[PDB]
Amino acid sequence: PAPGPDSLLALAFPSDPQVSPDGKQVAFVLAQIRPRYRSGLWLSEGGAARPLTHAETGRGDSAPRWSPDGQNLAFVRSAALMLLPLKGGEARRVTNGVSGPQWSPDGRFIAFTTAALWLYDVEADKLREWYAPEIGIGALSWWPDSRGVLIVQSQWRQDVYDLPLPTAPQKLLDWNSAAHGLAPHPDGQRFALIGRPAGKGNTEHAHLYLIENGQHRRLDTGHDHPVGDAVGGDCHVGAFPEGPRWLDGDTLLFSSTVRGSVGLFTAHIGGGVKAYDHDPQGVISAFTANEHGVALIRESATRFPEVELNGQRVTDLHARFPFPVREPQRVTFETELGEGEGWVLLPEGEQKVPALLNIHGGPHTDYGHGFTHEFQLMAARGYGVCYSNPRGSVGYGQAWVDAIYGRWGTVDADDLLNFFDRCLEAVPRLDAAKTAVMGGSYGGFMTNWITGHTTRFQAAITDRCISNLISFGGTSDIGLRFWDDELGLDFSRRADALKLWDLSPLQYVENVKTPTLIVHSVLDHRCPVEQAEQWYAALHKHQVPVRFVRFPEENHELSRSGRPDRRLTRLNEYFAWLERWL
Amino acid sequence: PGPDSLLALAFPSDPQVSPDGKQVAFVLAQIPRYRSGLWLSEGGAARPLTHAETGRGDSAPRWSPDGQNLAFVRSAVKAALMLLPLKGGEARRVTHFKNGVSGPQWSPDGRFIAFTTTPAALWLYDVEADKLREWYAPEIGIGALSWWPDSRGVLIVQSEDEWQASQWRQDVYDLPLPTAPQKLLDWNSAAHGLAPHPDGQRFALIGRPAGKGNTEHAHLYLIENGQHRRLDTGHDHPVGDAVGGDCHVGAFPEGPRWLDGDTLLFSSTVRGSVGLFTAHIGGGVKAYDHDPQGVISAFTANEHGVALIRESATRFPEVELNGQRVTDLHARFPFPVREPQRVTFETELGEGEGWVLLPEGEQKVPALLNIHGGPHTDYGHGFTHEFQLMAARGYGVCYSNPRGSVGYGQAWVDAIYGRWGTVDADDLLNFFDRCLEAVPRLDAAKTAVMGGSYGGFMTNWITGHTTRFQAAITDRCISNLISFGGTSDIGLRFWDDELGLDFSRRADALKLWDLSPLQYVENVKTPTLIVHSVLDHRCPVEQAEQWYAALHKHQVPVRFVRFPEENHELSRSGRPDRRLTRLNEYFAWLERWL
Amino acid sequence: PAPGPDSLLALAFPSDPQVSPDGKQVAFVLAQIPRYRSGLWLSEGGAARPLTHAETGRGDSAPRWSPDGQNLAFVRSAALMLLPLKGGEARRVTHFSGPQWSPDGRFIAFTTAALWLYDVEADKLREWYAPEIGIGALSWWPDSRGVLIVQSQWRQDVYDLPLPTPQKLLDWNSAAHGLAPHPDGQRFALIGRPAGKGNTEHAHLYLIENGQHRRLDTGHDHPVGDAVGGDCHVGAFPEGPRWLDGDTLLFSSTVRGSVGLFTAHIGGGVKAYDHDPQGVISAFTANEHGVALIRESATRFPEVELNGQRVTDLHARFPFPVREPQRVTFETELGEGEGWVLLPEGEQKVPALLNIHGGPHTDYGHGFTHEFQLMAARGYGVCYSNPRGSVGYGQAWVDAIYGRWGTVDADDLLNFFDRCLEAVPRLDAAKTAVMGGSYGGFMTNWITGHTTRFQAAITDRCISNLISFGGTSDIGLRFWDDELGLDFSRRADALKLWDLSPLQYVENVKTPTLIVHSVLDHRCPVEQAEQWYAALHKHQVPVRFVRFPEENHELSRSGRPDRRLTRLNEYFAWLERWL
């Protein structure tokens, strides 16, 4: 009997790999099993990790944070701040919930939000509200001197503030743009951030900037790739820290997405970027570091996420994967910007198998070397999965991103069908008569676009789709800016709205003949369900075979509450639709 | 210093020595509602190990043989088996039963944890495999249980069927580990405290042989090939703690333990004290730790160490490890304690004894005769918060061990057989007279009499046979011996054992009526406070309703306090309300009448 | 085919027959369906029709006509309601029992216990009097100036209570109820007994004037009120005497297992008004214009009547045929006693069940007993009698058992039973059982401890220890003083109570015994049954103890028939096991 969606319930999900201050231990979060996922803390001192807490109710424990002396672990329990002594005894609750705890480096305080910023005085065992922002607090880091914190706060434009310990926050940087990942320099005065300067739109690669007396200088020079993990994968449940960490006064360690992989690199104040730990066939999804050690989570297209400490794997999570994983093969396609790439994941055997073109979202993300249970399960059920990084994808340089600016549905659509044609030529086991196209978000937009511009696919599955760019501008919680950044078009202006209507898949819906599964959350704030309702009503009026699944659970329910119901049901509906149409 | 003083106290229990003999884990109940958590000492001041914020809390700490883990029972979750690694990390819940578990015991090899759960079945936790498995479903139920030292299985005490159970008679069985219990001893009598010998074949038990009535001192028996021979010979005192005191909250283990192949350590009640002694396979009983003015209420031991709880008439219970006190609980006692004075009385069996606890100062003070229950227990050297609080409020507390008490030999027990209300009442009033003579400060015109259970029977009896007391307080009383036989959960046997009388036989019923305080209630003139739980299964409230109704009809001043909480509410739920309210009513009644 | 206890659920139970002031209508209560709910029903002379409907709670009770005949006050669960009879739905006048209209229609008095007053014209409530001890009977003076109230060793007096802007009217110092103010506005009648009489004395009728009392039901050596057994009475059964004119007071009285209406005259003796010696009138109301009542027989289910015409169809609901009992006599030094045998169909031998009524000062006879009819429908011969101690055969018949329960009363029951076996050859002398409730349970315990002759016994709400009863019963303080002249709190008396205790003789019991008792019984505490059970179990007599969590009269209290159905099931299962 073939593996089904239930295979997911055998998996346990690691997150938040926190290296100890002395660099010799790693503490992390493991979520495991309507069945329901709960999270507990795990600890390794170099060997096989062991559970440290146990939760039988609620969402469980998260956010492990080492005290500077390495004798305690602060964590959040469901939400309350907990302190667990590592050498014996059970945790104590020291506090509508809490989040984002961070010890001061001197061990005297724990900062968290509850949202206002609050302060737990460790030696005095007292709480005090530190700062009640008017708009909200983004990134936060302690100065190495424990004098206070740096905070980010405000069209996605923010600045950086200095907030000393209480006895009012002063502005430290006129940034007026996107900023996160504050990494205070050891000297207590300079600091690094991740983002982009004021003049750049949000399709610009995020980069590393050194800040000094209000000036900025790019730190990850000569590296035409973004900071952070923007590679797809469906086995990340929980927090995935990627904050840059100064290894010495000259060396800032950070992660970066390059051609479907994510590696660690170092930027130097005195020069260029060096590889630190970058396998072009792997993804490092989270890391922590200090002067003594590094802990991270690693995965590949064939390897489930595992926790590592200083190069040694401390988890056994791939052994829980309930069926054999298969190795994809690479297939390239040509464009005026150079060679594009994608992959085909095949079932066992030698018979013809249906070909499923999967389109990643973003659009400025990458497919590639993340671990995708959904893809492995499709192959285990007899489908060939074809997935690629068209122009618009993020790991192939700024020009590859910029090629789709203002004209979604042109070169991106070409690249996807060019790739798919190359798959059929390169992989004779792919059945050219049993093809489907599918994707989520931008991938759903693209599924809607492609089926309205060709009838070649025998089935379509559109998830979290976009069909009407005009209505999206007014209903999405990012509608006010998303098209200005991605397309240079303002839906509230007449000439621009008409251009958005010409980029709308709904305009061409009269051409759709492909049986289509529509999957959407009723309460989606990013892609409102009105996008799916318009596509469904149009197909239904044309009597195109269509099925509309309306989830009452918002996206990412597994991370939000630990309930896998939405993901199991979604997979059931995907395969039921493919079994019905092939 | 009022009844509220109780809320300052924390109550220790279950002193469990580690296998290497160098640590003790125990239970501490503290504050409004008492919850219990586990505490640990390696020789110095004990430190908390768990913290209970909801429910009744944590209890039953059990060391894993390697000393690295503690199994325990948690209520927050009815009573779940928990496993706590001592070197770091939080406890793990190992059972998920609706009704919880009890009586966890590690096998000596550390491979299993045996426990019971709902009659409750015996279950097995496989430690290396992390699996649960039902071991044995008894027909009636399982009493004592111990592992063979080689961990091949357990010894269990149980009745064979409902016939034997209706006699309160049990045998001992061998129950090997599952891959069918065989009988090891045709006991057909009382047995508990199984102490398997290190040789893996013999074992000791506490109890009495079939031919002996239930008033015979519990003794120690060595079992070999179905044969029995008494082990604590030449020791005319019972095994176990039978001394009064009101600061025991939780489990108090007293299971005998082999210190070597010849030596079995046990506790025994002797003239109001409880001491440790050793029984020898090849010799007599020796004292091991016996202060004649102290009470050891619980202990554990192995070849490497001993842990216990110790107290006196002037010292609140403390936990010790190898002779060193590891708790500071007496320091929480909120007012100064005073020293009792001994006062004796004559009987044809020899001299009996009691004590007078006096308040500060030299003025005249009312005298309260307090009668212990049982009747086969002892007053003496346990710590009684109520007595110290009565003296702190200005009362002279007079309390004694009349014939019928348990610590003065079998003959002293037997003196009251079949004739409650004769020599026992004589001894109590003779003692009380000697108190008034020995201590001129006691006010002969402001006297009260009070007691619980048998003490309530005796309070009812005494007030119906003399008017001398100015006030009386009868708690959990007995007034009608006939109705008690049909209503009490032990009514079918208690009078048979204590008096040789069966209420269902006519000639015996009339004798039970002549031993009933209610028959003489027309003579009662003393203002009487009646205290009773509405749901008492042992002394049903009908016993108190009859006394109340009779007194009320004679228009004797009477007040009847009906608690909806059963007795021992502090132990059952941690709620001290019943104890505080009881003490409040006692003092209010004495303040009104003196 | 054989009917079981479930047959009970086919029945609807009438109560509280209230005649209209104009004498031409009756309003009454009907309890029907698993759970009984009650609603008000109305007849203007013909077949009664429903007037209220409630699908929650216990329903509606206490219908009271307004003096002008246009409204009906009633109690709904519990709150006072007013229903206009010629149209419109009821109104709730209280938002918080025993409502009584002033004769002039201006007020409604009720208790809530404190006495309260609803002003009809002002539509306001007001507390009238909050007694420290309690209020018993109550009636309005005919002038509506106020009410007479009874209130306090079970001794009471009568008070005068005028309308607010209480005085003592009679130093009675004894039992009084059924206040019936005379039309002249000064005299009043009561039911009870004078101070010098114990509670075993027949209740009688007394005319009160200026503190003096004179017996009104002279020459009638029988008690006022219905004291006949029957198990189809659910709800209130009014029996208050009513003046038909200034000389004539109408009342009911129990006579030899029947209950009839009679009239007492201020200037003469007692005359029959409506007395069939084979029927029972269980409740009535009357005025100068009409009479309404509920009537029954040993073969007729209770029905409501208005001025001699039956207005209900309730006997038609009885789901199996009823049978006619035959009378059997026995002789005593006080004269002839009587009882009855109810036989099943056919000609075959059948088991004989001796049933002992409670009280003990009540009567078996001509009430309707579903339990007895169902026992016969299931093949048992039911033998039931009125031994000395029973109430309908004169004061001497009552007084014969005083101070000595278990002597002549027990004699009469076994003498009666022996005469049944002689007179009724179909009764099987080898398959006999004895059973009863309350005093009848006392007597089942006593008899089985004094003879082995019965093959089965069923003791319900029993008494086994007269001493403990004295201290545990809510009437224990007085019951043995009244019934036996014995005080359990006195040493010499307690020994005599132990000699009257069935438990003293329990060693002789060999009869398999079913024990039925409520755990929360305040009248006969369950400790009485626990002692019998524990004693029989120790003697290894086959015994079964059914402990209900529902108190007695759960059907009346909540409308739930579960306790009666389960009880009947246990009775027949035990009889099936032993015969």
mmCIF file of C-alpha atoms in Angstrom, chain C residues 157-376:
data_model
loop_
_atom_site.group_PDB
_atom_site.id
_atom_site.type_symbol
_atom_site.label_atom_id
_atom_site.label_comp_id
_atom_site.label_asym_id
_atom_site.label_seq_id
_atom_site.Cartn_x
_atom_site.Cartn_y
_atom_site.Cartn_z
ATOM 1 C CA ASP C 157 -52.690 27.412 68.766
ATOM 2 C CA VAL C 158 -54.835 29.575 66.486
ATOM 3 C CA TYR C 159 -54.131 33.262 65.853
ATOM 4 C CA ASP C 160 -56.043 36.204 64.416
ATOM 5 C CA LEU C 161 -54.071 38.130 61.777
ATOM 6 C CA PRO C 162 -55.681 41.277 60.311
ATOM 7 C CA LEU C 163 -54.579 42.955 57.113
ATOM 8 C CA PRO C 164 -51.452 45.114 57.532
ATOM 9 C CA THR C 165 -51.602 48.889 57.762
ATOM 10 C CA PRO C 166 -50.896 38.834 65.105
ATOM 11 C CA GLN C 167 -53.307 38.316 68.019
ATOM 12 C CA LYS C 168 -53.907 34.953 69.701
ATOM 13 C CA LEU C 169 -57.467 33.638 69.304
ATOM 14 C CA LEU C 170 -57.494 30.143 70.865
ATOM 15 C CA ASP C 171 -55.224 28.472 73.442
ATOM 16 C CA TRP C 172 -55.596 25.030 71.851
ATOM 17 C CA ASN C 173 -52.135 23.682 72.675
ATOM 18 C CA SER C 174 -52.702 20.639 70.478
ATOM 19 C CA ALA C 175 -53.114 19.600 66.842
ATOM 20 C CA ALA C 176 -55.326 21.778 64.662
ATOM 21 C CA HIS C 177 -55.814 22.124 60.919
ATOM 22 C CA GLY C 178 -58.637 22.554 58.416
ATOM 23 C CA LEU C 179 -59.733 26.006 59.552
ATOM 24 C CA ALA C 180 -63.312 26.649 58.413
ATOM 25 C CA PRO C 181 -64.543 30.142 59.350
ATOM 26 C CA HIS C 182 -68.261 30.300 60.061
ATOM 27 C CA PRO C 183 -70.414 32.553 57.823
ATOM 28 C CA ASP C 184 -71.193 34.788 60.819
ATOM 29 C CA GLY C 185 -67.578 36.010 60.774
ATOM 30 C CA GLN C 186 -66.912 35.228 64.452
ATOM 31 C CA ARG C 187 -66.984 31.464 65.001
ATOM 32 C CA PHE C 188 -64.782 28.958 63.232
ATOM 33 C CA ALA C 189 -64.397 25.202 62.975
ATOM 34 C CA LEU C 190 -61.203 23.172 63.067
ATOM 35 C CA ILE C 191 -60.119 19.566 62.675
ATOM 36 C CA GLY C 192 -57.879 18.126 65.346
ATOM 37 C CA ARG C 193 -57.999 17.019 68.957
ATOM 38 C CA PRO C 194 -58.123 18.898 72.272
ATOM 39 C CA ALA C 195 -55.061 19.366 74.450
ATOM 40 C CA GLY C 196 -55.741 16.366 76.685
ATOM 41 C CA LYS C 197 -55.649 13.846 73.819
ATOM 42 C CA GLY C 198 -52.690 11.983 72.348
ATOM 43 C CA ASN C 199 -52.209 11.752 68.595
ATOM 44 C CA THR C 200 -53.722 8.264 68.415
ATOM 45 C CA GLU C 201 -57.097 9.837 69.197
ATOM 46 C CA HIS C 202 -59.440 10.163 66.228
ATOM 47 C CA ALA C 203 -59.259 13.611 64.685
ATOM 48 C CA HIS C 204 -62.642 15.303 65.121
ATOM 49 C CA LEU C 205 -64.526 18.501 64.230
ATOM 50 C CA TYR C 206 -64.655 21.400 66.700
ATOM 51 C CA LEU C 207 -66.702 24.599 66.736
ATOM 52 C CA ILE C 208 -64.788 27.463 68.370
ATOM 53 C CA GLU C 209 -66.529 30.389 70.083
ATOM 54 C CA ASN C 210 -64.943 32.905 72.485
ATOM 55 C CA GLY C 211 -62.158 30.434 73.232
ATOM 56 C CA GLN C 212 -64.546 27.570 74.018
ATOM 57 C CA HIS C 213 -64.695 24.399 71.959
ATOM 58 C CA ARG C 214 -67.521 21.913 71.405
ATOM 59 C CA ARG C 215 -67.268 18.734 69.360
ATOM 60 C CA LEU C 216 -69.371 19.042 66.219
ATOM 61 C CA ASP C 217 -69.217 15.545 64.690
ATOM 62 C CA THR C 218 -70.825 13.938 67.730
ATOM 63 C CA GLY C 219 -72.018 10.341 67.706
ATOM 64 C CA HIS C 220 -69.524 9.418 64.968
ATOM 65 C CA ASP C 221 -66.704 7.232 66.306
ATOM 66 C CA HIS C 222 -64.497 7.727 63.237
ATOM 67 C CA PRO C 223 -61.779 10.226 62.235
ATOM 68 C CA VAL C 224 -62.149 13.276 60.019
ATOM 69 C CA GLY C 225 -60.277 13.008 56.723
ATOM 70 C CA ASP C 226 -59.138 10.342 54.297
ATOM 71 C CA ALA C 227 -56.937 7.696 55.943
ATOM 72 C CA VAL C 228 -57.458 4.906 53.356
ATOM 73 C CA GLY C 229 -54.646 3.517 51.307
ATOM 74 C CA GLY C 230 -54.405 3.673 47.536
ATOM 75 C CA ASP C 231 -51.449 4.372 45.254
ATOM 76 C CA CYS C 232 -52.986 6.631 42.586
ATOM 77 C CA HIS C 233 -52.968 9.932 44.511
ATOM 78 C CA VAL C 234 -50.428 12.341 43.001
ATOM 79 C CA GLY C 235 -50.804 15.968 44.084
ATOM 80 C CA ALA C 236 -52.827 17.920 46.614
ATOM 81 C CA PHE C 237 -56.079 16.447 47.979
ATOM 82 C CA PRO C 238 -58.088 19.206 49.694
ATOM 83 C CA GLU C 239 -60.405 18.121 52.490
ATOM 84 C CA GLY C 240 -61.133 21.398 54.286
ATOM 85 C CA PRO C 241 -64.577 21.498 55.879
ATOM 86 C CA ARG C 242 -66.954 23.949 54.232
ATOM 87 C CA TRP C 243 -70.092 25.558 55.636
ATOM 88 C CA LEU C 244 -73.049 24.878 53.371
ATOM 89 C CA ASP C 245 -75.185 27.191 55.518
ATOM 90 C CA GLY C 246 -74.990 28.665 59.004
ATOM 91 C CA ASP C 247 -75.873 25.280 60.527
ATOM 92 C CA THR C 248 -74.234 22.717 58.243
ATOM 93 C CA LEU C 249 -70.531 21.892 58.015
ATOM 94 C CA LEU C 250 -69.536 19.431 55.287
ATOM 95 C CA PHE C 251 -66.551 17.156 55.928
ATOM 96 C CA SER C 252 -65.095 13.764 55.006
ATOM 97 C CA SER C 253 -64.481 10.830 57.320
ATOM 98 C CA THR C 254 -62.882 7.382 57.120
ATOM 99 C CA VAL C 255 -65.174 4.465 58.001
ATOM 100 C CA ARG C 256 -64.182 0.782 57.585
ATOM 101 C CA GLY C 257 -61.887 1.185 54.593
ATOM 102 C CA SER C 258 -64.153 3.751 52.903
ATOM 103 C CA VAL C 259 -64.170 7.546 52.920
ATOM 104 C CA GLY C 260 -67.470 9.373 52.724
ATOM 105 C CA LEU C 261 -68.742 12.925 52.984
ATOM 106 C CA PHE C 262 -70.952 13.777 55.958
ATOM 107 C CA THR C 263 -72.563 16.901 57.391
ATOM 108 C CA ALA C 264 -72.242 18.064 60.974
ATOM 109 C CA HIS C 265 -74.985 20.311 62.320
ATOM 110 C CA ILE C 266 -74.495 23.013 64.926
ATOM 111 C CA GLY C 267 -77.848 21.983 66.453
ATOM 112 C CA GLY C 268 -77.827 18.211 66.002
ATOM 113 C CA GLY C 269 -75.899 15.096 65.063
ATOM 114 C CA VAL C 270 -74.045 13.773 62.009
ATOM 115 C CA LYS C 271 -75.894 12.845 58.801
ATOM 116 C CA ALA C 272 -74.529 11.093 55.727
ATOM 117 C CA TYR C 273 -74.077 13.319 52.673
ATOM 118 C CA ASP C 274 -72.366 11.067 50.114
ATOM 119 C CA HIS C 275 -71.119 7.806 51.640
ATOM 120 C CA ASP C 276 -70.783 4.626 49.625
ATOM 121 C CA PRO C 277 -69.232 2.060 52.017
ATOM 122 C CA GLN C 278 -67.404 0.535 48.990
ATOM 123 C CA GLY C 279 -65.901 3.795 47.682
ATOM 124 C CA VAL C 280 -63.452 6.486 48.745
ATOM 125 C CA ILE C 281 -63.878 10.251 48.285
ATOM 126 C CA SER C 282 -60.262 11.422 48.503
ATOM 127 C CA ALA C 283 -60.723 15.170 47.990
ATOM 128 C CA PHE C 284 -63.543 17.682 47.769
ATOM 129 C CA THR C 285 -64.432 21.356 47.628
ATOM 130 C CA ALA C 286 -67.870 22.872 48.144
ATOM 131 C CA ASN C 287 -69.914 26.034 48.551
ATOM 132 C CA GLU C 288 -73.594 26.942 48.663
ATOM 133 C CA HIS C 289 -73.949 26.268 44.920
ATOM 134 C CA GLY C 290 -71.978 23.130 44.116
ATOM 135 C CA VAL C 291 -69.594 20.341 45.033
ATOM 136 C CA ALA C 292 -66.594 18.853 43.255
ATOM 137 C CA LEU C 293 -64.698 15.786 44.367
ATOM 138 C CA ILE C 294 -62.469 12.895 43.362
ATOM 139 C CA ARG C 295 -63.954 9.413 43.788
ATOM 140 C CA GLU C 296 -62.569 5.893 43.507
ATOM 141 C CA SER C 297 -63.167 2.294 44.506
ATOM 142 C CA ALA C 298 -61.104 -0.868 44.751
ATOM 143 C CA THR C 299 -62.046 -1.437 41.072
ATOM 144 C CA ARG C 300 -62.347 2.162 39.787
ATOM 145 C CA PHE C 301 -59.446 4.511 39.128
ATOM 146 C CA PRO C 302 -59.897 8.034 40.601
ATOM 147 C CA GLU C 303 -62.161 10.342 38.584
ATOM 148 C CA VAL C 304 -63.233 13.959 39.018
ATOM 149 C CA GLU C 305 -66.920 14.773 39.600
ATOM 150 C CA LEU C 306 -68.965 17.971 39.557
ATOM 151 C CA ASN C 307 -72.370 17.836 41.272
ATOM 152 C CA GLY C 308 -72.696 14.083 40.808
ATOM 153 C CA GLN C 309 -71.599 13.927 37.161
ATOM 154 C CA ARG C 310 -68.275 12.359 36.209
ATOM 155 C CA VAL C 311 -66.223 14.754 34.036
ATOM 156 C CA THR C 312 -63.025 12.719 33.447
ATOM 157 C CA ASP C 313 -62.242 9.565 31.451
ATOM 158 C CA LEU C 314 -59.290 8.279 33.449
ATOM 159 C CA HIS C 315 -60.365 4.699 34.195
ATOM 160 C CA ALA C 316 -60.484 4.092 30.439
ATOM 161 C CA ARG C 317 -56.690 4.535 30.401
ATOM 162 C CA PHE C 318 -56.076 1.601 32.725
ATOM 163 C CA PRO C 319 -54.231 -0.824 30.425
ATOM 164 C CA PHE C 320 -55.357 -4.237 31.722
ATOM 165 C CA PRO C 321 -58.631 -5.491 33.225
ATOM 166 C CA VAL C 322 -59.228 -4.805 36.903
ATOM 167 C CA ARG C 323 -60.433 -7.606 39.147
ATOM 168 C CA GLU C 324 -62.927 -7.600 41.999
ATOM 169 C CA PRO C 325 -61.678 -8.567 45.477
ATOM 170 C CA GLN C 326 -63.598 -10.833 47.827
ATOM 171 C CA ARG C 327 -64.043 -10.099 51.544
ATOM 172 C CA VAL C 328 -62.776 -12.435 54.279
ATOM 173 C CA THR C 329 -63.422 -11.921 57.987
ATOM 174 C CA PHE C 330 -61.602 -12.803 61.201
ATOM 175 C CA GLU C 331 -62.729 -12.754 64.829
ATOM 176 C CA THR C 332 -61.259 -10.802 67.767
ATOM 177 C CA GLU C 333 -62.214 -9.898 71.334
ATOM 178 C CA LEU C 334 -63.219 -6.460 69.960
ATOM 179 C CA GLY C 335 -65.471 -7.981 67.315
ATOM 180 C CA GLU C 336 -65.187 -8.957 63.701
ATOM 181 C CA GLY C 337 -62.246 -7.715 61.653
ATOM 182 C CA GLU C 338 -62.121 -7.750 57.875
ATOM 183 C CA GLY C 339 -59.730 -8.010 54.954
ATOM 184 C CA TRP C 340 -59.832 -8.851 51.257
ATOM 185 C CA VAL C 341 -58.377 -11.241 48.697
ATOM 186 C CA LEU C 342 -57.784 -10.167 45.090
ATOM 187 C CA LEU C 343 -57.434 -13.187 42.806
ATOM 188 C CA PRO C 344 -56.007 -13.625 39.303
ATOM 189 C CA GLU C 345 -58.034 -15.034 36.436
ATOM 190 C CA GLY C 346 -58.312 -18.804 36.035
ATOM 191 C CA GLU C 347 -58.900 -21.631 38.501
ATOM 192 C CA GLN C 348 -55.307 -22.773 39.263
ATOM 193 C CA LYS C 349 -53.491 -22.529 42.574
ATOM 194 C CA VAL C 350 -51.684 -19.197 43.021
ATOM 195 C CA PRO C 351 -49.192 -17.816 45.549
ATOM 196 C CA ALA C 352 -50.584 -15.856 48.495
ATOM 197 C CA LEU C 353 -49.174 -12.417 49.345
ATOM 198 C CA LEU C 354 -50.002 -10.944 52.745
ATOM 199 C CA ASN C 355 -49.709 -7.169 52.412
ATOM 200 C CA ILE C 356 -49.631 -5.085 55.603
ATOM 201 C CA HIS C 357 -50.635 -1.442 55.399
ATOM 202 C CA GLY C 358 -48.608 1.256 57.160
ATOM 203 C CA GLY C 359 -49.718 3.906 59.599
ATOM 204 C CA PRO C 360 -50.494 1.928 61.583
ATOM 205 C CA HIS C 361 -53.675 4.035 61.977
ATOM 206 C CA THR C 362 -54.889 3.853 58.376
ATOM 207 C CA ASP C 363 -57.220 1.467 56.542
ATOM 208 C CA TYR C 364 -57.033 -0.894 53.627
ATOM 209 C CA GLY C 365 -60.214 -1.396 51.683
ATOM 210 C CA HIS C 366 -61.868 0.596 48.935
ATOM 211 C CA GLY C 367 -59.115 2.798 47.609
ATOM 212 C CA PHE C 368 -57.727 1.979 44.204
ATOM 213 C CA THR C 369 -54.353 0.175 44.341
ATOM 214 C CA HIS C 370 -52.564 -0.317 41.002
ATOM 215 C CA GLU C 371 -49.863 -2.363 42.750
ATOM 216 C CA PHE C 372 -52.460 -4.881 43.970
ATOM 217 C CA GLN C 373 -54.221 -5.102 40.606
ATOM 218 C CA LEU C 374 -50.882 -5.654 38.890
ATOM 219 C CA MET C 375 -49.920 -8.383 41.398
ATOM 220 C CA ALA C 376 -53.137 -10.241 40.525
#
